[PDB]
Amino acid sequence: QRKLEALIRDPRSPINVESLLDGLNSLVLDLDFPALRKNKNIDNFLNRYEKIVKKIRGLQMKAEDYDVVKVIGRGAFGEVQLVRHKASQKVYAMKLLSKFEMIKRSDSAFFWEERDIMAFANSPWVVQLFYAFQDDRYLYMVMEYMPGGDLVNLMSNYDVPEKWAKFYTAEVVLALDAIHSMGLIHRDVKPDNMLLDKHGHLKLADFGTCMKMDETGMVHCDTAVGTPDYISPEVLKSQGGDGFYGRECDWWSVGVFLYEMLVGDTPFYADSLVGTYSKIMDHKNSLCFPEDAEISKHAKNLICAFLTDREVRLGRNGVEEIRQHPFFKNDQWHWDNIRETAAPVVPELSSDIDSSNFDDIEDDVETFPIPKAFVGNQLPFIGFTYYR
Amino acid sequence: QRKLEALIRDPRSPINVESLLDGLNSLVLDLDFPALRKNKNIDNFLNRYEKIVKKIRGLQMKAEDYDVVKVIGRGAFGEVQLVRHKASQKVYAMKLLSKFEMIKRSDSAFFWEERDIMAFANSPWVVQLFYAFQDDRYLYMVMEYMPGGDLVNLMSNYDVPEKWAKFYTAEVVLALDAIHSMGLIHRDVKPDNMLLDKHGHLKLADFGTCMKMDETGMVHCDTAVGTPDYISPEVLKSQGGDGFYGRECDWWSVGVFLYEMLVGDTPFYADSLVGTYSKIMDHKNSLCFPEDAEISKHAKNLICAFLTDREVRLGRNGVEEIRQHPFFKNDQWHWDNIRETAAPVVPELSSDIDSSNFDDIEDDVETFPIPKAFVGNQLPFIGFTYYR
Numbered sequence A, B: 001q002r003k004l005e006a007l008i009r010d011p012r013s014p015i016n017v018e019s020l021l022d023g024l025n026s027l028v029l030d031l032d033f034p035a036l037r038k039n040k041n042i043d044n045f046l047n048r049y050e051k052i053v054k055k056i057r058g059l060q061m062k063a064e065d066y067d068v069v070k071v072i073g074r075g076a077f078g079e080v081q082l083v084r085h086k087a088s089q090k091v092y093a094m095k096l097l098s099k100f101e102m103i104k105r106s107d108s109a110f111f112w113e114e115r116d117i118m119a120f121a122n123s124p125w126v127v128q129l130f131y132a133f134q135d136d137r138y139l140y141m142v143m144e145y146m147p148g149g150d151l152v153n154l155m156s157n158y159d160v161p162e163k164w165a166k167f168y169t170a171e172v173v174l175a176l177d178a179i180h181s182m183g184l185i186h187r188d189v190k191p192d193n194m195l196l197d198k199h200g201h202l203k204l205a206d207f208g209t210c211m212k213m214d215e216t217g218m219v220h221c222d223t224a225v226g227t228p229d230y231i232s233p234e235v236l237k238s239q240g241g242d243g244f245y246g247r248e249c250d251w252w253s254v255g256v257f258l259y260e261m262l263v264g265d266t267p268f269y270a271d272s273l274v275g276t277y278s279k280i281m282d283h284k285n286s287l288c289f290p291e292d293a294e295i296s297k298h299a300k301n302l303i304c305a306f307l308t309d310r311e312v313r314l315g316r317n318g319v320e321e322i323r324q325h326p327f328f329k330n331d332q333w334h335w336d337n338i339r340e341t342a343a344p345v346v347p348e349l350s351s352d353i354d355s356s357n358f359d360d361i362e363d364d365v366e367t368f369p370i371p372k373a374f375v376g377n378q379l380p381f382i383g384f385t386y387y388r
């Protein structure tokens, strides 16, 4: 009778208070309908709790506590908004995820690992999450705002020297090492999910595709997860069932990354997905540099090191072999202190709501149909709420 | 964001932790069925919480923490058991209430007031409740054990003098005054629900029929609640709709009580319910003493005082008029100290599990059918769990 309390005090546990509240709240949201209320038990339940649940809901953190400055990103499950918290006037980034879409597109569990990583990493490479909350429509995540934009934007606005590539890649390595050391594989590494902070130092951003490893160091996965241009071949083949893979796959991607950075296009680019896949599987005979784009011998090697079968891939036998590859030899920074050194491009920013390093998003509302019997659409999202 | 915590810390509140747990637990109990688990959302929910809920359930207080010494009472919703708590070896009385029967007989909300009264009265006249807990089958209430039995038993085993009647009635008065002062009407006063403690002093026992009063001091009730022999006529007539009644009705019953005690039969006894009702409505011309049973002039008056219309009933204008009625004049005790004086009959008891003052109960299992859709049978019982 003494453990239990600590169970509920524990911020990491699924039956800590906020989750329990999520419970009453999601239960109520999922039972309060005229059709279901024809059931006495459901009716006489709601009469008891419908009131205090509303009150609770008010005391909670809510979307209206924040001003929305501007939408800095948008995708198929929601948006990311620049915001300012009213009472404190502090600026944040806030990710909205449509509960309606997640149910519809049957993809309603990809955020747990994102939650816990951002909540608990306590790492300079992992964008921090301060609060996680929700309402009948969305999930919200309040994050430290990374004002530097992403590496896509940098590469879109720069011909990148190696001196720089050596830096950013280095930082990607340490970042991926942190996640790996937490027992997780990133699975969707790419400049898109690499954000530069106020000083121009990377943090990994989107973790919707993360997965925990075995006591060994592997994942049994039967679905391909990732983004065509950067998917490694071990992960592509896993699709066809019985796939047993590990962290090596992220290093593949770190590979493509550096190619993209230096050469200027992706190393398996195509006019199609089939044309990207089929060519990634032929990585042996398909990877090739332009003569004109003269990348160095050391840089050339690091790429090919990553771009090969998993059994021979740089990183197969530790991160150490990666770190001490000679392409990372330089005067500017050591691996002890890279993130406290003067990054290649420091963001010019006017104010705490300067979002110039992000593109302008357009702006151009769909909710669940009323149920006739109990379907339980809010059940997937119980345990999501989190307070610093 | 600061109130809320205190809300949940508050033992009186419905969203205090135990209730929240009751929530997850009852949700799980009501969703874990093959039929419903064909619903993805319900399935993928249970997979997350089914495990820790079981663990929680183990850490909880449970029926197996108690030995069952013997069944000291049984009725249509359950039993009352003498018990001993294993770890502490302390004896208690424990009331079981069948969840299955309460759903079936559509009477699943009569225990809340019983819970709170016994939990929170902090009164010598109100049997104390130490813990309230539950499982898929029953509700359990762990109470201080009243080893003296009830006043039915005493009257069954004694020709009662007035000196005694003056005492017990007195104690009933103070007891009913306490409940009244808590904003509640008892509605089922009768010796059955009067238990003598170790020293032979009354406490009121069953509160399944209690009701809170208005800011005025009344109850709007359209159902007759009580037990034929002791129902007052105002409450009988309330049945026929539009009944507005108050605490006076308990004093009616305190009336019958004293009659039963002194004369030896109930003052509206019959071979039937119709014969009991119809005769209670004629209380004007129907109440009458036996000449042989010579009750005193003062005692005679107190009865008739209670046994009359509500508008003229002793107690209509306060408890004071009751207290200083001359039938209560005596040398033994004052109203300041009655309960610390030497009761009329002190229980002879051999051990802490002596239940000689209770009858032997026989002993001669019916649970819910598996649901096909969500019905919510555990919803009525969310918020019942309580720990000292």
Ligand SMILES: NCc1ccc(Oc2ccc3c(c2)B(O)OC3)c(F)c1
Pocket: A072, A073, A075, A080, A093, A095, A127, A143, A144, A145, A146, A147, A192, A193, A195, A205, A206
């Ligand atoms: N897979 C593409 C992607 C990249 C980044 C995403 O999230 C963001 C976007 C922008 C910012 C942040 C987080 B953040 O913490 O500061 C600014 C995001 F939601 C999706």
Ligand SMILES: NCc1ccc(Oc2ccc3c(c2)B(O)OC3)c(F)c1
Pocket: B072, B073, B075, B080, B093, B095, B127, B143, B144, B145, B146, B147, B192, B193, B195, B205, B206
């Ligand atoms: N309406 C009849 C009735 C009377 C008393 C009831 O409960 C009991 C019975 C016996 C005991 C207790 C409580 B208790 O706290 O000590 C002994 C009870 F459950 C029903």
